[PDB]
């Protein structure tokens, strides 16, 4: 039940939590919860389950959680807005791009492997294999979302395209954005053209 609440309410409810952050203190987050980034999260962990789930696992959960919040940031920040018309089509050409990203991270990664993961944990007839099967969830979510190594070839692109979500929100020039956009896009393609097998599942467009 506790593991279900963990992997459900993060990895919805946190939508309302993060919308206020668009508009910071360490005590305000607490009273919102009990009702460039990096948050402080702690909750009561009981002892008989604190000994079966490792301490270091929660940190890994925290890393991928942070990236998911950044994806929420981009999918909301470009998506609240109410030559001259030229601004609008840098909406559409970019409003797709985050969406195509957001559908891949949430559904294809954080909902496929979780649905598989529940079907794995229901078969644990032993305490010992139960620790292993969540560790073998960690080491595969660690490669699907590449957080170990060769990270300077991939993750900086995901980081640098997030700046466009700030840039287009501030503007309300147009040409200096497409010059940036085609370069980071073509750099992403000229890295991504190597393909480990799953990565063409996003490289469809």
């Amino acid at each position: 039940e506790y593991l279900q609440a963990m992997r459900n309410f993060f990895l919805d409810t946190m939508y309302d939590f993060y919308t206020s952050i668009f508009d910071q203190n360490v005590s305000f987050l607490n009273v919102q919860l009990q009702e460039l980034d990096g948050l402080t999260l702690s909750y009561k962990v009981p002892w008989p389950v604190d000994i079966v789930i490792s301490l270091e696992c929660q940190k890994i959960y925290n890393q991928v959680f942070l990236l998911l919040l950044q994806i929420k940031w981009a999918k909301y920040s470009l998506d609240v807005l109410l030559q001259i018309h030229r601004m609008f089509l840098l909406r559409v050409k970019l409003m797709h791009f985050v969406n195509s990203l957001h559908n891949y991270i949430m559904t294809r990664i954080l909902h496929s492997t979780g649905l598989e993961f529940q079907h794995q944990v229901e078969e644990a007839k032993d305490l010992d294999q139960l620790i292993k099967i969540h560790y073998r969830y960690l080491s595969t979510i660690h490669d699907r979302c590449l957080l170990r190594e060769k990270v300077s070839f991939v993750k900086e692109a995901i980081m640098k395209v997030l700046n466009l979500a700030l840039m287009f929100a501030d503007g309300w020039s147009i040409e200096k954005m497409e010059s940036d956009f085609k370069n980071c896009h073509m750099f992403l393609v000229t890295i991504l053209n190597k393909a480990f097998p799953h990565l063409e599942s996003l490289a469809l467009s």
């Binding site: 919805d12 999918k75 909406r91 559409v92 050409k93 797709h96 791009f97 294809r108």
Partner: protein, 420 residues
Amino acid sequence: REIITLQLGQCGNQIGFEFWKQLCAEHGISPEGIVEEFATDRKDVFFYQADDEHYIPRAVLLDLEPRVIHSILNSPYAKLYNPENIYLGNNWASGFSQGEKIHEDIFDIIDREADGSDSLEGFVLCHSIAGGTGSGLGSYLLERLNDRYPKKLVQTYSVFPNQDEDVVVQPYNSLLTLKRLTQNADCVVVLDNTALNRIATDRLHIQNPSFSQINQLVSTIMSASTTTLRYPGYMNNDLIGLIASLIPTPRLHFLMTGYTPLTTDKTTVLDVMRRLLQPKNVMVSTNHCYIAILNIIQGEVDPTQVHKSLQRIRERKLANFIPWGPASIQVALSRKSPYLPSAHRVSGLMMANHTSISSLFERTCRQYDKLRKREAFLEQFRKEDMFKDNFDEMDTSREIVQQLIDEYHAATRPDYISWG
């Protein structure tokens, strides 16, 4: 956040009554609104939650010349709601003037319901285009909300009147109504009488009580479009997150719908996708191309087939859409509904912006322009005479819908890179 529902007119109050009976039977509650023990859900968006769990709906009821509103009044679902908000021609200017004189106390009803809410997401209205009492009045209250609140959304579900042409001022009224719809609303969901007539004559053999079955199909659609709200999902649980992808442009904000079974009394993701690609499973009747399509599926789905399906959907090119830019279909999943028999297991709902609906607008434009050339079809009723002595609002609406149809026909082009 929280969404406040509005209902007015004979067809609008009919479909609202059917929607509330739909969500009464759908969730585990009584017809007085007491929760059933045998049933969990969120019903906090369209219903205010009480202490005995009386989910009293956020439905403001306005009536004019009530006949069916009386039948709504004495009902076993009249214990579900009583927000004390019921307050009393067939012309646009008539309903406009009648709403004009009582705009203050109905605005008090609005602000009272707004104070009933802590936060807010949007206003839905139940309305029918050229419905008589609903027409004009609905445009007026649309003007009142658009003046009052630029911080919220309006979603509108309304039908296109086609009775296969005694009332000849109907194209004028619908034209003025749609003028206010394009300029004072943010997103429109429109349907046809004729397409529902086709699906009803195909699924069944009824011709005369067609309104009743139309109400059933509207209720199924309105539940389907709201399922990710009412059953707890984790994406686009705000309305604006749903609306944002389909509308790039503030005049082309008209959304057409489809739903996979015509008769509902395995199916695979491939089957229901290609069925949903048909215009005969869509409830609205050069090559036309979509700007963007959205699909939500609800049923017993296998998660690995769905990536196979959209691979092959690229491969067959069974859709033809190219606005000018990279806006494609969005597929989503919602919960298969408990607390009802789950037969016809997998069912999909489809939401797109397609340019073909302009042709249907053009059909009405062809009618109105013809009547405007003759100028004998306002019938010189006194209401339109007071409201505009020179009848120049019709010409202003004509130039606006000319801009709209031209925006549509340019929106077909792959040179829509500018003026989008």
